[PDB]
Amino acid sequence: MPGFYEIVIKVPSDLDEHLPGISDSFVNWVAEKEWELPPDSDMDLNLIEQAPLTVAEKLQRDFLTEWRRVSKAPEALFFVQFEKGESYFHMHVLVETTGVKSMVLGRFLSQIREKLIQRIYRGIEPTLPNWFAVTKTRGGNKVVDESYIPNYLLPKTQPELQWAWTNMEQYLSACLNLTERKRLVAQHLTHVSQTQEQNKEN
Ligand SMILES: [Mg+2]
Secondary structure (H helix, E strand, C coil), X not given: CCCEEEEEEEXXXXXXXXXXXXXXXXXXXXXXXXXXXXXXXXCCHHHCCHHHHHHHHHHHHHHHHHHHHHHCCCCCCEEEEEEECCCCEEEEEEEECCCCCHHHHHHHHHHHHHHHXXXXXXXXCCCCCCCEEECECCCCECCECCCXXXXXXXXXXXXXXXXXXXXXXXXXXXXXXXXXXXXXXXXXXXXXXXXXXXXXXX
C-alpha cells in the first residue's frame, strides 16, 4: 500500500574525469573486486562492467543501511537497479516511504549522502553534476507505486541493465534473469488489460 521514493545516484566510470583526487586505496579496492553471476542467471557477464559495479554495490548496500536507521523500518522494501546510461552509470533506488515524512526527506537524504561520501569515497566527493538526487514532481517529493518497476525498470536489457538488487519476493528471481523479467512484464500488462476489459464491460 505505501509508495516509493526514488533516488537516482550517478556512479563514476572514469577515474580522472569523475573522481579527481580519489585515493590510491580506493583505486586498489575497485581493482580487487570480482563479481560472478548466480547460477540461476541467464545474463552475459561479458556485458557487465566490473569496476563501476563494485562502487554501485557498495553505494546501494550502504544507502540501505542508513535508510533503515533513519526510517526506523528494518524491513523496508526496496528495489535497486543499476544501469549504464548514455552519459553516466546510474542507480535507481526505490525505497518505501514508511518512516520518512516528505517534509523531512531532504534532511535525511542529505545525512545519508554525507555518509556515502565518507564510506565509499573516503571523504572525496565525486565530480558528478547532480549525483545524488531525489525525484521530484517538478515540486514536492515524488511517490510512486509498485507498478513503476514493471513499467520502467524490468523491461531493461543488457547492456543498459548492469545489475539489480531487491528484497521484494515477487522480484527476487527477476533481478538477474532476463527471461523472468520478460515474463513479469507480460504478466503485469496482462493484468492491466484485463482490468480495462472489465471496465469497458459492465
Ligand atoms: Mg535509466
